[PDB]
Amino acid sequence: MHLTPEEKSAVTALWGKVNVDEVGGEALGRLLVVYAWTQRFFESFGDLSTPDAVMGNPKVKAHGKKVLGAFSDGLAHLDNLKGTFATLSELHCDKLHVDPENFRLLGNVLVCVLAHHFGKEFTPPVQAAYQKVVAGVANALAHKYH
Amino acid sequence: MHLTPEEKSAVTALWGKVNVDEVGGEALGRLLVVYAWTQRFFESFGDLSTPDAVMGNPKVKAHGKKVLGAFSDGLAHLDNLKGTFATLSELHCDKLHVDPENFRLLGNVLVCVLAHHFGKEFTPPVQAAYQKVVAGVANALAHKYH
Amino acid sequence: VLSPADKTNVKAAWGKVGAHAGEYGAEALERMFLSFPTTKTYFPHFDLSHGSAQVKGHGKKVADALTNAVAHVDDMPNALSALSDLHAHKLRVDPVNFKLLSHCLLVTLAAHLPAEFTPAVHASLDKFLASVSTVLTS
Amino acid sequence: VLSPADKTNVKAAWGKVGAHAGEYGAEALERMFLSFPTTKTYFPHFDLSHGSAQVKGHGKKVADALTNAVAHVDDMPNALSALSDLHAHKLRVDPVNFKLLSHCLLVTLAAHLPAEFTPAVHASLDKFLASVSTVLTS
Ligand code: HEM
Ligand code: HEM
Numbered sequence: 382m383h384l385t386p387e388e389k390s391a392v393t394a395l396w397g398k399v400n401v402d403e404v405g406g407e408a409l410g411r412l413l414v415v416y417a418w419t420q421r422f423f424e425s426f427g428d429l430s431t432p433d434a435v436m437g438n439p440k441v442k443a444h445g446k447k448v449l450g451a452f453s454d455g456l457a458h459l460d461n462l463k464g465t466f467a468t469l470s471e472l473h474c475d476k477l478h479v480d481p482e483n484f485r486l487l488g489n490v491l492v493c494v495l496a497h498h499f500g501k502e503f504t505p506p507v508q509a510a511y512q513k514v515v516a517g518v519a520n521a522l523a524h525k526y527h
Numbered sequence: 528m529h530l531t532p533e534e535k536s537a538v539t540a541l542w543g544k545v546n547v548d549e550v551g552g553e554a555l556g557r558l559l560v561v562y563a564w565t566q567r568f569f570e571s572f573g574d575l576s577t578p579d580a581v582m583g584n585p586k587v588k589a590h591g592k593k594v595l596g597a598f599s600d601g602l603a604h605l606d607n608l609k610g611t612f613a614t615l616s617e618l619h620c621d622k623l624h625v626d627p628e629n630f631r632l633l634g635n636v637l638v639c640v641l642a643h644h645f646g647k648e649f650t651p652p653v654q655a656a657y658q659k660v661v662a663g664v665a666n667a668l669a670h671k672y673h
Numbered sequence: 674v675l676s677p678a679d680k681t682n683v684k685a686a687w688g689k690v691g692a693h694a695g696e697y698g699a700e701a702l703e704r705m706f707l708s709f710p711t712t713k714t715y716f717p718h719f720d721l722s723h724g725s726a727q728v729k730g731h732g733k734k735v736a737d738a739l740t741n742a743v744a745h746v747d748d749m750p751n752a753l754s755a756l757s758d759l760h761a762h763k764l765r766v767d768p769v770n771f772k773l774l775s776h777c778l779l780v781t782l783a784a785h786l787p788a789e790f791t792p793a794v795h796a797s798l799d800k801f802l803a804s805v806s807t808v809l810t811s
Numbered sequence: 812v813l814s815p816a817d818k819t820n821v822k823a824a825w826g827k828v829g830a831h832a833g834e835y836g837a838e839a840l841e842r843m844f845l846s847f848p849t850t851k852t853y854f855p856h857f858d859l860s861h862g863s864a865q866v867k868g869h870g871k872k873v874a875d876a877l878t879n880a881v882a883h884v885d886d887m888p889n890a891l892s893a894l895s896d897l898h899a900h901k902l903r904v905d906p907v908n909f910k911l912l913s914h915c916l917l918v919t920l921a922a923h924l925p926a927e928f929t930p931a932v933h934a935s936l937d938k939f940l941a942s943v944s945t946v947l948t949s
């Protein structure tokens with residue numbers, strides 16, 4: 382992960398102002414609204430018929446929180462996303478059957494949502510650095526697919 | 528580049544049978560025919576208006592031999608593609624302005640062509656190895672763009 | 674779009690494929706599973722092993738869907754209307770996987786038809802395939 | 812495919828972009844170059860430094876074509892005809908760079924329309940740049 386000493390810095394400082402409960406909720410939420418087919422993996426969450434319904438659903442929110450929570454473990458081991466996310470990789474492949482291609486969709490929605498809560502501060506440079514993180518991650522989750 | 532010993536074997540083996548003078552002509556040539564836009568890159572080759580003109584064009588045959596030489600030269604260093612291609616990656620970026628995305632195509636056109644020369648011998652598993660090797664070479668060439 | 678000459682080449686290559694389409698259907702399907710493990714995620718229920726008796730049958734269904742697409746080259750979107758809902762409602766397979774399979778029919782198609790898979794027929798076929806993929810993705 | 816409700820949210824979001832389209836276009840372009848350095852290969856004859864004439868003006872060029880598209884939401888292909896022959900025959904840009912440009916527009920719009928960028932608007936906006944992209948790669 383060719384992250385540079387400045388980039389790493391840009392990311393972290395920002396990450397430490399992130400309201401985990403909101404961002405995670407919102408991101409998983411906009412994945413279900415924006416890329417509807419993804420709804421197929423959570424058919425077991427409840428009402429996911431409408432925007433308001435997906436945003437408003439408590440399992441989405443909670444799950445959201447766990448997902449962002451894991452995204453967070455990764456930022457604390459940038460020099461080794463592979464190993465952190467190995468178990469979830471296999472998990473996501475052997476039990477859940479998720480085309481790793483959707484991992485990027487979640488990465489981008491997330492960038493989209495961070496841009497959303499921070500307006501200016503999500504200056505282009507900062508954005509680039511998170512594009513990489515989101516990128517290493519998605520790759521780290523696809524790594525144990527077989 | 529996770530290349531198992533077996534793959535590494537299956538690869539090298541086969542390649543000892545390739546006639547790089549002959550196969551590289553075919554590839555770059557096919558590239559120019561199956562992917563037409565990839566001519567915006569050799570207007571110095573003269574006529575390239577019909578398949579026959581492309582395939583038979585001397586400049587094409589010469590150029591492809593070059594390309595294929597660099598490939599062969601990456602197969603003699605499977606464990607260090609990033610370095611082996613560093614100078615040639617920069618070149619394709621700074622001087623030739625080739626969108627990395629076009630490395631995958633030539634890489635694939637090749638895989639097709641190997642299958643065309645060897646037939647039954649170009650068995651699925653050998654292919655899996657080869658796909659791994661072109662994927663890497665495409666990334667190696669792509670890894671110095673900024 | 675498909676040109677008249679493109680159409681013509683598609684038909685003379687598949688004409689040669691002949692009765693070996695399911696064979697070819699399957700060989701491809703296999704190359705796909707081995708060269709690009711992610712594509713397996715859509716067949717979690719299949720026996721994906723070398724020789725698999727499910728892989729062969731599927732393959733057929735595929736080859737046969739393509740033949741059907743050939744014979745209806747001028748009206749592919751409706752000729753495949755059903756396999757279109759299938760691959761974009763029930764299943765919902767990502768378009769990139771479509772390029773992978775495509776890249777394997779071409780390869781399988783190339784090791785078996787030495788004489789016919791000329792530059793022109795490869796250019797044509799690649800485009801037919803892109804077409805069949807675009808219909809199943811829209 | 813754009814459903815009426817999408818056209819509606821689009822027609823709206825964009826009308827809030829208003830006289831700032833150009834300013835957002837250029838932000839978006841500046842983000843794409845910084846976030847995905849490869850897209851830079853298509854603009855080798857441009858200065859790509861922070862806040863420079865070309866990007867700022869080319870930015871006007873791009874937002875202005877989206878405006879024309881929003882306006883002609885319901886007939887997009889005809890109205891974009893010229894723009895497509897240029898991104899398909901002259902420049903000939905890989906469809907992929909289009910996903911990147913569109914992501915960035917979204918980040919940007921999302922960046923200055925905090926209230927407007929709702930999960931449904933986020934939605935339609937993505938299906939729009941997706942349709943604008945398809946007509947420019949056909
Ligand atoms: C980096 C991207 C992603 C990360 C970090 C992530 C993370 C997680 C985590 C931590 C869990 C809980 C693991 C456990 O409880 O054992 C999980 C479960 C799950 N994930 Fe992912 N995920 C990602 C993307 C996706 C996407 C794209 C899909 C499908 C669209 C998906 C589908 C699922 C499903 C269906 C579950 C099971 C929820 C349950 O327990 O009912 N994930 N994911
Ligand atoms: C594995 C993929 C590729 C390899 C190994 C490769 C290799 C090479 C080599 C060895 C040369 C001669 C280098 C030099 O002159 O310093 C070259 C030149 C060049 N390459 Fe690539 N190449 C690859 C793919 C591509 C493709 C996809 C493009 C664009 C279609 C491309 C565009 C060019 C161009 C325009 C030249 C300059 C030719 C001239 O004007 O003399 N290469 N490439």
Ligand code: HEM
Pocket residue numbers: 712715716734735738739756759760764766770771774805806809
């Ligand atoms: C030209 C490309 C393709 C064609 C022509 C094609 C055709 C078909 C056909 C005919 C069926 C069977 C429908 C039936 O049994 O009634 C099918 C099913 C299916 N296809 Fe495709 N397919 C293509 C590509 C793909 C690819 C790329 C994927 C995923 C990577 C895929 C995944 C599936 C799956 C999971 C099923 C259902 C399997 C089952 O449960 O029976 N197909 N396809």
Ligand code: HEM
Pocket residue numbers: 850853854869872873876877894897898902904908909912940943944947
């Ligand atoms: C929504 C997507 C896009 C739209 C609406 C769009 C629109 C335009 C427009 C209106 C022009 C100016 C045409 C003229 O000079 O009259 C243009 C030029 C150009 N665009 Fe695109 N564009 C899009 C995406 C892309 C992206 C993805 C690329 C490459 C990554 C790209 C590369 C170019 C290039 C290289 C030019 C020529 C610029 C010059 O030399 O001044 N465009 N585009």
